[PDB]
């Protein structure tokens, strides 16, 4: 309703960098809010793309941002009669960013890895990797849970079981309130998908530079499966956390698997041991149900609700025809130990190929009426096809079926405005939570400030 679409703030990265592909709010040790921005095609030291991360101080005028520097150099270690190798070319550093406490986690899902031993090798594969920074201290760490030193032949002899070579760890990421990093790795276990978790504190204390393969003993990974429903399911394409079992000392994980069961798609809610508590099945094959997931209590009963995006959902129209528009599903959490039901609300796109539901950001309570609200991105939506973000307000029965506000892209065609979204943080300290919108195709991010309701 009350985001200001007249006086925006723009931050800009280098041309071709995809600045804005990912973003998050970051609070420093003093509560000063900054914006962390991923730019996964930023050029590295060999004038080759490796990605980068920027940490933008809050200014109404916006502008250029300083880099948050990470080591962009390929590493080699000869040890244990093996040769360990990292390859950061085209790794996509900043394809996901997330902030927690005074720490920033920025991931490079396409970082490649190999191990040589005489004439054999592990195979050069995209294990992915995450880089962790504490900006104020300069501390740096890394976490790459899918690196191994097993040779190609042993996977073949063991029927490709527990094959983490194509994980793409960091493809999606989230940090629990207690500070456990949870990474989605949609290529894990030969394209089934996996989740990897470890406390941030243990990531920092276990890392040393140059080691490349090290143990983070408090870590926990999900499991391989023999069930074809999971094959090529990309479980971990999106991740979120929330409270869904009524027990406030356990944190539950929400995981999107948008090609689960022969492209039907699914989202699963699990406990922290990766045991499945609920599964939401997609409605339409190829809709990419699970592309995005969001967790927020929208109806003011103190129980977290789930939103799921299916950006390629085709809506039925006159004369037995179908129109790709995208859809968002709201599932309200019932009282007590019961199943999440059918959806409580379906929100459906209008613009053909608009990809409504491609991103869903909790906004907190934007209009200050006691119900949390959401923003849904349609990156190619709007009457001009340039991208739209739509705000829907919470209410006692769930969400309103009609947007309170629509933000049309201020950028040119092709910007992908809305592909990344983040809300629920008051960046200017005016007592209303604000919205940051990435437009990676324009290498920019737009800040919408919430203002008093008119």
């Amino acid at each position, epitope marked *: 309703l009350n985001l200001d679409p007249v006086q925006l703030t723009f931050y800009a990265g280098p041309n071709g960098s995809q600045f804005g592909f990912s973003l998050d709010f970051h609070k420093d040790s003093h509560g000063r809010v900054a914006i962390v921005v991923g730019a996964p095609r930023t050029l590295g030291p060999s004038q080759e793309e490796t990605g980068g991360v920027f940490l933008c101080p809050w200014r109404a005028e916006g502008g250029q941002c300083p880099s948050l520097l990470f080591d962009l150099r390929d590493e080699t*270690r*000869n*040890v*244990g*009669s093996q040769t360990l190798q990292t390859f950061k070319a085209r790794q996509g550093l900043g394809a996901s960013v997330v902030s927690w406490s005074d720490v920033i986690v920025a991931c490079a899902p396409w970082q490649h890895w190999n191990v040589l031993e005489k004439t054999e090798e592990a195979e050069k594969t995209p294990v992915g990797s995450c880089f962790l920074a504490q900006p104020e201290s300069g501390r740096r760490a890394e976490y790459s849970p899918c690196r191994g*030193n097993t040779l190609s032949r*042993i996977y073949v002899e*063991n029927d490709f079981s527990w094959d983490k070579r194509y994980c793409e760890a960091g493809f999606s990421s989230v940090v629990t309130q207690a500070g456990e990093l949870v990474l989605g790795a949609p290529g894990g276990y030969y394209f089934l998908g996996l989740l990897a978790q470890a406390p941030v504190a243990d990531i920092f204390s*276990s*890392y*040393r530079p*140059g*080691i490349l*393969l*090290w*143990h983070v*003993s408090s870590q926990s990974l999900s499991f391989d499966s023999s069930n074809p429903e999971y094959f090529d399911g990309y479980w971990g394409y999106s991740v979120a956390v929330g409270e869904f079992d009524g027990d406030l000392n356990t944190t539950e994980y929400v995981v999107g698997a948008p090609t689960w069961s022969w492209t039907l798609g699914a989202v699963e809610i699990l406990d922290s041991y990766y045991q499945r508590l609920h599964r939401l099945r997609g409605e339409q094959m190829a809709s990419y149900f699970g592309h995005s997931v969001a967790v927020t209590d929208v109806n003011g009963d103190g129980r977290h609700d789930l939103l799921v995006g299916a950006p390629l959902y085709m809506e039925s129209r006159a004369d037995r025809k179908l129109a790709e528009v995208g859809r968002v599903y709201l599932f309200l959490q019932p009282r007590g130990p019961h199943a999440l039901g059918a959806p409580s609300l379906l929100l459906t796109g209008t613009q053909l190929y608009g990809r409504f539901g491609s991103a869903i950001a909790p906004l907190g309570d934007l209009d200050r009426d006691g119900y949390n609200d959401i923003a849904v991105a349609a990156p190619y939506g709007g009457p001009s096809g340039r991208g739209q973000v739509l705000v829907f307000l919470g209410q006692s029965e769930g969400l309103r079926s009609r947007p309170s506000q629509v933000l049309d892209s201020p950028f040119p065609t092709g910007s992908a405005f809305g592909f990344s979204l983040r809300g629920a943080v008051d960046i200017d300290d005016n007592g209303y939570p604000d919205l940051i919108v990435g437009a990676y195709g324009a290498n920019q991010v737009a800040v919408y400030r919430a203002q008093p309701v008119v």
Partner: antibody
Amino acid sequence: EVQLQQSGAELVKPGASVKLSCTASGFNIKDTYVHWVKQRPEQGLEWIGRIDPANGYTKYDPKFQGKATITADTSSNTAYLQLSSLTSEDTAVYYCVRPLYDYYAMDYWGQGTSVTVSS
Amino acid sequence: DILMTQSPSSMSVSLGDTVSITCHASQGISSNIGWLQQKPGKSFMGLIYYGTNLVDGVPSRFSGSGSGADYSLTISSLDSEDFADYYCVQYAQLPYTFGGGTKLEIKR
């Protein structure tokens, strides 16, 4: 707290075999490589081999090919060293070892099992 | 196999001293070296891994340095508990090989 707890002193006849154990405490033995190391006062420290208890794959110094067999049972959280066709020169203290962080290192050691081979 | 020549085999030093123990490998091992301590009649504790990294719990009076084939363990200001045996180990290559050790004894 990580501790490797080895079996007690063994006292066996020459030509026999003995199976030393090393039980992980405060962790899953599956987490890292487990190594076995031989100490004598004269010859000093010698690496026997290692095992990855997750999958059972082993590596040995070729000097111990035939003598040393390293196995593991993740069910009992334990790694073993079997020495066959025992001799006076097999009389030593035997240690199981695992790394702290580095996959390839040798940082945590069990308390040692004493073996004496005599008639 | 990589030979690890550790020196000196023993030294008679005193409390407060700064003493260095060196280890020379028969070829470069790119800091894939660990240092170990064996107190009289007790088992081993790891001190250093990968050349220069302190094992958790080890006091900072211990430092490791070196590169290529030549490495050092330095102990600054010896405590009574530091009089013990020390061994290097390399893990650049299988089989892992150890130095012949260094016993710190009390001078008088």
